[PDB]
Amino acid sequence: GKLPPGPSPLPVLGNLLQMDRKGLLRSFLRLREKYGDVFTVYLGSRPVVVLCGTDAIREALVDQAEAFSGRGKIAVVDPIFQGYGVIFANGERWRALRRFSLATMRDFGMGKRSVEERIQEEARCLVEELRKSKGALLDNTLLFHSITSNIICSIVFGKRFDYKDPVFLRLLDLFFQSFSLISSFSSQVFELFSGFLKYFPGTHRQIYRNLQEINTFIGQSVEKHRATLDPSNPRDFIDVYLLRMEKDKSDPSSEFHHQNLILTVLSLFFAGTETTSTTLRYGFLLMLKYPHVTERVQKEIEQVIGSHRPPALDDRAKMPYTDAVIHEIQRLGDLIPFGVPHTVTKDTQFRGYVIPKNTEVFPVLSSALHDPRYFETPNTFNPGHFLDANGALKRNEGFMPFSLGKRICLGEGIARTELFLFFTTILQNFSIASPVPPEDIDLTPRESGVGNVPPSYQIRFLARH
Ligand code: HEM
Ligand SMILES: OC[C@H]1O[C@@H](O[C@H]2[C@H](O)[C@@H](O)[C@H](OCCCCCC3CCCCC3)O[C@@H]2CO)[C@H](O)[C@@H](O)[C@@H]1O
Ligand SMILES: OC[C@H]1O[C@H](O[C@H]2[C@H](O)[C@@H](O)[C@H](OCCCCCC3CCCCC3)O[C@@H]2CO)[C@H](O)[C@@H](O)[C@@H]1O
Ligand SMILES: OC[C@H]1O[C@H](O[C@H]2[C@H](O)[C@@H](O)[C@H](OCCCCCC3CCCCC3)O[C@@H]2CO)[C@H](O)[C@@H](O)[C@@H]1O
Ligand SMILES: OC[C@H]1O[C@H](O[C@H]2[C@H](O)[C@@H](O)[C@H](OCCCCCC3CCCCC3)O[C@@H]2CO)[C@H](O)[C@@H](O)[C@@H]1O
Ligand SMILES: c1ccc(-c2ccc([C@@H](c3ccccc3)n3ccnc3)cc2)cc1
Ligand SMILES: c1ccc(-c2ccc([C@H](c3ccccc3)n3ccnc3)cc2)cc1
Ligand SMILES: c1ccc(-c2ccc([C@H](c3ccccc3)n3ccnc3)cc2)cc1
Incomplete structure (x- = not known):
């Protein structure tokens, strides 16, 4: 009948400068261990509900989908105005943004030429570009940002x-x-x-x-x-x-607005390609750590696709092992560990508690992606997590990299497609290597940022013959 349990907002002089995951994870783990899978923490004087594990997250985003379908808020994190919500003064600007965003999103899914075809074309140009490196050690950051960006x-x-x-x-x-x-x-x-x-x-x-x-x-x-x-x-x-x-026909002021809003929207599209890039970068770092898995993938590519034609989206259906590998890459990649915040659309009853309408809720995706209840080896690369006894692809409740419910990632489609085509097309034409021996590959993300991003690393692409 009250908000989930959790620490008090007081004292005020208790360092309102939380800034780091290595210590925020420590704090998160402590809170979960003490209060359970559903607790409340305060940002300033603002209550924020945190959901942990596959069960709690699905019970909210799926079982009470409508209730947890509200958009999250943008809150001040600094000590000054800590917790205050910030919004655009003109509500119309926001509505217009949502409108153009969706319209543009629809327009990109149109045209005679398919997106799959453009991704294949890009994959082809990537192969050629990599060959020019003749296997030298390089940082794949610029090229991985380039291949996703070029589609836009x-x-x-x-x-x-x-x-x-x-x-x-x-x-x-x-x-x-x-x-x-x-x-x-x-x-x-x-x-x-x-x-x-x-x-x-x-x-x-x-x-x-x-x-x-x-x-x-x-x-x-x-x-x-x-x-x-x-x-x-x-x-x-x-x-x-x-x-x-x-x-x-519109005045310069209004014309400016339409034009600039389009540019702003295109900017968001460009920024969004970074999640896919980062996943690819994480994926190859992971492949460096498991050379034999990489070989199996190459073997499946050989069996199904061969070597005289480029991979196509429909080849994935016949490549359960590679599919399983990509799932693990996203799972362990864990790009948005804390999830994207939502708000409940009404006073909501959840596991015995009452979450007041408009309260912010964070479904901590990381706690699901590494849920011991649903993954046999939560902290270890394991394609078995998505394969049945006969090696056929199978789904897993803990897998929710794009989140779930009514606010599920609008871009999951294109991201999956790019991951599959880029990942298979590259490995079809190259093998990879690193000075760092497999057993020493460190999958620890950069200490900065809110998401998980692999720190810079060296890798070489060996052209295959
Ligand atoms: C590997 C890549 C990606 C991952 C893991 C990912 C992840 C997510 C997640 C976890 C959310 C939050 C869902 C929630 O509110 O609970 C989200 C939202 C969203 N994503 Fe992505 N995303 C990726 C790629 C993309 C791409 C390529 C685009 C853009 C074309 C994009 C567009 C969006 C949009 C517009 C939303 C907000 C949807 C809504 O609230 O209704 N995402 N994404
Ligand atoms: O004095 C006005 C000057 O305008 C310049 O820019 C034009 C451009 O030529 C004209 O293309 C532009 O309209 C289109 C640009 C607005 C953004 C369009 C977006 C479409 C989607 C992809 C991103 C861009 O209108 C501008 C004028 O408002 C013209 O280049 C000049 O010749 C002209 O003298
Ligand atoms: O409020 C009183 C407590 O303050 C400190 O503990 C803080 C920690 O210093 C502080 O780092 C911690 O932060 C918790 C919020 C951040 C992690 C939880 C979620 C935040 C939103 C995104 C998902 C994760 O909250 C704790 C409880 O408030 C002191 O260390 C405690 O001794 C004291 O009892
Ligand atoms: O149409 C008016 C809407 O008002 C609220 O939506 C908020 C949204 O929840 C809220 O996310 C949005 O914030 C504006 C965008 C986020 C701030 C961006 C700036 C942050 C500082 C740096 C520059 C960028 O403002 C909207 C209002 O202007 C209500 O919640 C909506 O229900 C309502 O539809
Ligand atoms: O027709 C209504 C549609 O509503 C939702 O789509 C929303 C999405 O839920 C919603 O996330 C999206 O938002 C567009 C703006 C994206 C965020 C922009 C902010 C990013 C952070 C910095 C400030 C700006 O607008 C879409 C189109 O309105 C539903 O998800 C759709 O299924 C439904 O078709
Ligand atoms: C309730 C209490 C605390 C927080 C919190 C919010 C943000 C952060 C902190 C953060 C640091 C690392 C990962 C994710 C978030 N941060 C600071 C500026 N941007 C992100 C730390 C804590 C959120 C809700
Ligand atoms: C293709 C399509 C669009 C763009 C593009 C280029 C520049 C910008 C430009 C921008 C300026 C600074 C950072 C990010 C974007 N902007 C954003 C809103 N109004 C102008 C936005 C979009 C680039 C390539
Ligand atoms: C139109 C097109 C795209 C977007 C957009 C909305 C949110 C993001 C946001 C994102 C923001 C910055 C870098 C990478 C991704 N995101 C995260 C996971 N899925 C999306 C990126 C783009 C918004 C309007």
């Missing part, structure tokens, strides 16, 4: 970029390069007081460069498309925009 570029501009095209490299840099922001508590307060909120990284110097060349490219590309536009046959998304602009 292909869809938008009509064709992919060459990996070394300056515009493309500046684009990858704009979205994924880390930059340093220098400021004091006082200077940040002063900015807000002056009416400015600069949240994203990049000083004039840093970003003005990339951005300037990028805009020029977009400008002229929109120009070329317009000069050769065929209303009967839209080639790509730029055409779709030009056509869906016919009779868009």
